[PDB]
Amino acid sequence: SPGVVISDDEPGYDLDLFCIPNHYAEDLERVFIPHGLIMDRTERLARDVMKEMGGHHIVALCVLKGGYKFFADLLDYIKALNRNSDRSIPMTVDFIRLKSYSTGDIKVIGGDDSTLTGKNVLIVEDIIDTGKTMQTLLSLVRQYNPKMVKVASLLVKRTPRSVGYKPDFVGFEIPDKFVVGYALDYNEYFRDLNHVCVISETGKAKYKA
Amino acid sequence: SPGVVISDDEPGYDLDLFCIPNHYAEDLERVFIPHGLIMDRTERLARDVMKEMGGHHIVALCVLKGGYKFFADLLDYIKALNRNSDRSIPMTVDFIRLKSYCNDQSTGDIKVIGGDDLSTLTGKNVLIVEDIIDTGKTMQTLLSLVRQYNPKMVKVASLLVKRTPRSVGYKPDFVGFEIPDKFVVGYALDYNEYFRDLNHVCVISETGKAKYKA
Amino acid sequence: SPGVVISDDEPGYDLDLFCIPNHYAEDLERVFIPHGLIMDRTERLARDVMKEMGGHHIVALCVLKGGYKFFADLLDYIKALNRNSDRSIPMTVDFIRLKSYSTGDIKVIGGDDSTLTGKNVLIVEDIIDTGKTMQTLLSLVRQYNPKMVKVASLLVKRTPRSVGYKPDFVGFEIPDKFVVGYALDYNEYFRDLNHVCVISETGKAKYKA
Amino acid sequence: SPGVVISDDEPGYDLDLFCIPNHYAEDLERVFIPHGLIMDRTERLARDVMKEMGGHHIVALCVLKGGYKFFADLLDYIKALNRNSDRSIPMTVDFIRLKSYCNDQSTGDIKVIGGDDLSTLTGKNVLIVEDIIDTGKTMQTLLSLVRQYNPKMVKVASLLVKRTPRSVGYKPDFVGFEIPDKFVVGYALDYNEYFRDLNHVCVISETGKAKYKA
Numbered sequence A, C: 001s002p003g004v005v006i007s008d009d010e011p012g013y014d015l016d017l018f019c020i021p022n023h024y025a026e027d028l029e030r031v032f033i034p035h036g037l038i039m040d041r042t043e044r045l046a047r048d049v050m051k052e053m054g055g056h057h058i059v060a061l062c063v064l065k066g067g068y069k070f071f072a073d074l075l076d077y078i079k080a081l082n083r084n085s086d087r088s089i090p091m092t093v094d095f096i097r098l099k100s101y102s103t104g105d106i107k108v109i110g111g112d113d114s115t116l117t118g119k120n121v122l123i124v125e126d127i128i129d130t131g132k133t134m135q136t137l138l139s140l141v142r143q144y145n146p147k148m149v150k151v152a153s154l155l156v157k158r159t160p161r162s163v164g165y166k167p168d169f170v171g172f173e174i175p176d177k178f179v180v181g182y183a184l185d186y187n188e189y190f191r192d193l194n195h196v197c198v199i200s201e202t203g204k205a206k207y208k209a
Numbered sequence B, D: 001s002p003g004v005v006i007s008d009d010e011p012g013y014d015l016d017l018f019c020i021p022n023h024y025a026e027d028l029e030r031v032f033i034p035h036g037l038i039m040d041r042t043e044r045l046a047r048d049v050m051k052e053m054g055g056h057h058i059v060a061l062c063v064l065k066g067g068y069k070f071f072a073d074l075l076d077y078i079k080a081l082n083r084n085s086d087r088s089i090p091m092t093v094d095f096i097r098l099k100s101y102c103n104d105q106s107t108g109d110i111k112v113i114g115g116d117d118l119s120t121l122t123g124k125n126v127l128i129v130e131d132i133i134d135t136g137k138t139m140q141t142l143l144s145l146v147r148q149y150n151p152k153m154v155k156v157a158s159l160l161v162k163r164t165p166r167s168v169g170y171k172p173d174f175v176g177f178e179i180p181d182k183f184v185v186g187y188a189l190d191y192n193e194y195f196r197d198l199n200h201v202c203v204i205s206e207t208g209k210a211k212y213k214a
């Protein structure tokens, strides 16, 4: 299942239908995915996750993108599914330093996946674009002979440039457009905006350096 | 603002993508407006209200069918905005059940003298909150009732508003969303006291609609 | 079980340990019960409630105090317990106009409890003081021959003036002091303050009219 | 501020009054600091941080034992405060794992050149967040490491801080709470990757402490 598909021809919402920080008001084009919708769509994701992974210890890894938020918001729901459990069950949390840097940067450095050998792994990225990053990330997590590997992602841009990666868990599948907000940033800006919006030709301009 | 518009042809979302109780998984056709979506719009709305009403003693009046939810929610956003004032300003909260029969006259017990506590409103600033306007009748009969008490200002806030031919054509001041002539349940809206626990707004199905009855 | 007892000799917290609207800063003496603690303590309450009342249709009534908040916050948790249910189960919500006004103001007016005859009832008040209100409220809800009646309350002041009412569900049992915040108000003020605090001789002064 | 103080003699709360997983209902002694309590304090703290740090590009640095929770939470309060600026200001978020052995020298791979991305910090305003300071060692070794990069300002924020004789006697800038020399778990703190799902902070019991092991 593809997640919630948003069409190419999607208009999104006027910036006025919600609360957008006034300081980003010329920088943003449209709200595409309002905060609460992400939340609910994420609640369910968690669920499809546990369906096939609850029951045994798992290792949730965060891609080091610098977008911890979604990872968090998802872990919180994965934790609330775990209480109902009858026996206690550990879970380990972590970031993967690196995502298309390779080899022996994995055999050791990324071999603290020596720690992954034999365990069930769940990788968490926020948006997937060309897929490169991720794919080069399974190659190596793979060398570790993990027992199993799933990949949840919040967004899956549909680009002619996909390099074929299709995660196991999708929240939303989007047009190929440039988004910020919620858990995506731009040069360290838009971290305080919690709806996924399209950025404007102007926004992308002034934010740089 | 027409609030967020939802054209007749909107197909919603399939049950599959959100969390829904399994016991109503047969009683619904599609997710119409998911909880969080509801939430974000309401936050906006609150700002919108205070644009107008803010800085004054506001009397928040609630129109009481089968629930409370929306109101309560909205009010948390308002309160939360009244936190920032350099001056403490009162708020008055009220509940009014009105579904008489028609009106068709009738006395003293519960009706005209429920205006006694209405003089409470007079030279006041009022905010009437409703959840969903259908025909719009209820609303229209309250303005009347209210407008007698000579209020300083009346403003109405709807979460949702249906497009229908069955409408007395009334339009709130603050609309959360304008929807198509569909029967929805969940979040704030009930059907015979069912769906109370469903958070998203959806369209019922015939089975559950026909299965939960009078 | 008495709920969470707070001692006579309780100091509470300095106003500075939390977020209090600056406009009530000379009006309040201490934070006694911070918002989140109420929340959790309420989460559990719900639970003890369902334990003995889940399973059949229930009628949750709110005392018309003019303090809807707690009632709401509790219903929301009672609703989230209901989803896990296998069969769908109705629940009806309402306020009781009146609470130590009597008689035939109950036989009809309060007889829309004719609607209560045969049903399982749950009454919700926010703070109980001398108990009068409530007690005169069971007398009449009783005339209706309800099938069963429980009474949850958020706060139970311990006063020499209790007139003996002891609710079935208690969140916190407090000294005899005058509180505001969360879901308690004073002449329509303090509705925007979400911690339960003690009011000061000054606060009670300027708020009146 | 010592944050909220919890004298050695605090007895906590019994399991009975809050929601706790049944599978840990034998592995804990008492609720020490319930989730919401945690929450309210953190909100305060955020205000406190922006008092000092606010209006500038802040680099938020996270000290990475076994979790993330507190940080994440804190940051929502900060972000939420940066919403109000008439000017958009960046934020930088970072994660630093440091638990070497001691230090005892060692090369190139992961250590000194993890300063390469530290020049990132230099003439910067820094905020180091930790969850619980015990001996205080970890903290002390970071200031050092950090202070080299010549930063414009370092400030540390702890959720909790234990009173112990085993302490290098370091004291954060922002303390959520100062506690007694007890072993706690839950909310943000884990014990061998257990208690991850417990929301309140509590004191372990011998059984679960002795039952979950290395």
Ligand SMILES: Nc1nc2c(ncn2[C@@H]2O[C@H](COP(=O)(O)O)[C@@H](O)[C@H]2O)c(=O)[nH]1
Pocket: A065, A127, A128, A129, A130, A131, A132, A133, A134, A157, A177, A178, A179, A180, A184, A185, A186
């Ligand atoms: N802010 C933001 N980052 C994006 C967007 N699309 C892709 N990226 C960033 O560029 C990375 C490239 O991922 P890849 O192209 O390797 O699949 C993404 O992982 C993400 O970090 C976008 O719409 N906005």
Ligand SMILES: Nc1nc2c(ncn2[C@@H]2O[C@H](COP(=O)(O)O)[C@@H](O)[C@H]2O)c(=O)[nH]1
Pocket: B065, B066, B130, B131, B132, B133, B134, B135, B136, B137, B138, B139, B182, B183, B184, B185, B189, B190, B191
């Ligand atoms: N569940 C639900 N109740 C509705 C709907 N339309 C109207 N009603 C109920 O009937 C009332 C209609 O009031 P009107 O505006 O028709 O006078 C609404 O406030 C609501 O309580 C709907 O589509 N769904």
Ligand SMILES: Nc1nc2c(ncn2[C@@H]2O[C@H](COP(=O)(O)O)[C@@H](O)[C@H]2O)c(=O)[nH]1
Pocket: C065, C127, C128, C129, C130, C131, C132, C133, C134, C157, C177, C178, C179, C180, C184, C185, C186
């Ligand atoms: N604001 C506030 N109201 C209180 C307090 N104690 C009692 N009352 C109000 O006075 C009512 C009297 O309840 P009773 O005295 O009948 O038990 C309470 O139900 C509540 O509405 C208090 O500490 N603060």
Ligand SMILES: Nc1nc2c(ncn2[C@@H]2O[C@H](COP(=O)(O)O)[C@@H](O)[C@H]2O)c(=O)[nH]1
Pocket: D065, D066, D130, D131, D132, D133, D134, D135, D136, D137, D138, D139, D182, D183, D184, D185, D189, D190, D191
């Ligand atoms: N669960 C838990 N971990 C602790 C406690 N005290 C210390 N630790 C862990 O060990 C670290 C101690 O760092 P120190 O300040 O001792 O250098 C803490 O950040 C924490 O991860 C405690 O009471 N409970």
